[PDB]
């Protein structure tokens, strides 16, 4: 129906999703600046569930964008995008839990020392999957 019409919302959705991944990394990095308690156990134990919660939240955000698109319409193109997300989503969740635990173990000051490597590594893996998705979408549109 509309060229620039459909393009504006679709473009917005892709940008937000990439931002969302960055946002997940941002929440933990932001948290370290301000410390309070650290008994080794509770701290690390609390973090593992928190990471799981963040991944679930990202999935929810994607669902919200799709529902909005349907509402605007009146008063596959979507199937492929979903598939890419699933592959990346599975890898990111595994990476976040495994990377965080490993980072803490190698050093002594799991606090800041664990956070710098754990945060950077998780973001890189998710980005790589996302990059693959971007190339596929561009090729389709010609």
């Amino acid at each position: 129906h509309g060229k620039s019409k459909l393009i504006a919302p679709l473009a917005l959705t892709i940008f937000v999703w990439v931002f969302l991944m960055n946002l997940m990394d941002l929440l933990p990095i932001d948290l370290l600046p301000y410390i309070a308690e650290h008994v080794l156990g509770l701290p690390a134990l609390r973090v593992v569930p928190s990471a799981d919660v963040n991944v679930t939240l990202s999935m929810a955000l994607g669902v919200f964008i799709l529902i909005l698109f349907y509402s605007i319409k009146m008063k596959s193109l979507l199937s492929k995008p979903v598939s890419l997300g699933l592959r990346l989503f599975g890898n990111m969740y595994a990476g976040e839990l495994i990377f965080i635990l490993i980072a803490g173990l190698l050093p002594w000051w799991s606090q800041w020392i664990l956070n710098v490597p754990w945060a950077i590594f998780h973001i890189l893996i998710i980005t790589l999957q996302a990059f693959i998705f971007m190339v596929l979408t561009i090729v389709y549109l010609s």
């Binding site: 593992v48 596959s76 199937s79 979903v82 598939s83 699933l86 599975g90 595994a94 839990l97 495994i98």
Partner: protein, 79 residues
């Protein structure tokens, strides 16, 4: 013990995930191919092909993917 433990454990993730992951990928290719022929041969389920291709694929990968998350969750984590 601890030696063959950590070694067997890791190797487990690799043998398990690579073996089940491979089994997964292959099947998607196997069943996906055959399925496609059928689901596509049908009247107008061509779109069904892809729509279910993504779901059938992810569900096949979800296995080792689950073993990885669940595995490392108590493996690499709890050690």
């Amino acid at each position: 013990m601890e030696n063959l433990n950590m070694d067997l454990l890791y190797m487990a993730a690799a043998v398990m995930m690579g073996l089940a992951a491979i089994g997964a990928a292959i099947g998607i290719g196997i069943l996906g191919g055959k399925f496609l022929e059928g689901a596509a041969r049908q009247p107008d389920l061509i779109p069904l092909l892809r729509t279910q291709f993504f779901i059938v694929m992810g569900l096949v990968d979800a296995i080792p993917m689950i073993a990885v998350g669940l595995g490392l969750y108590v493996m690499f984590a709890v050690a």
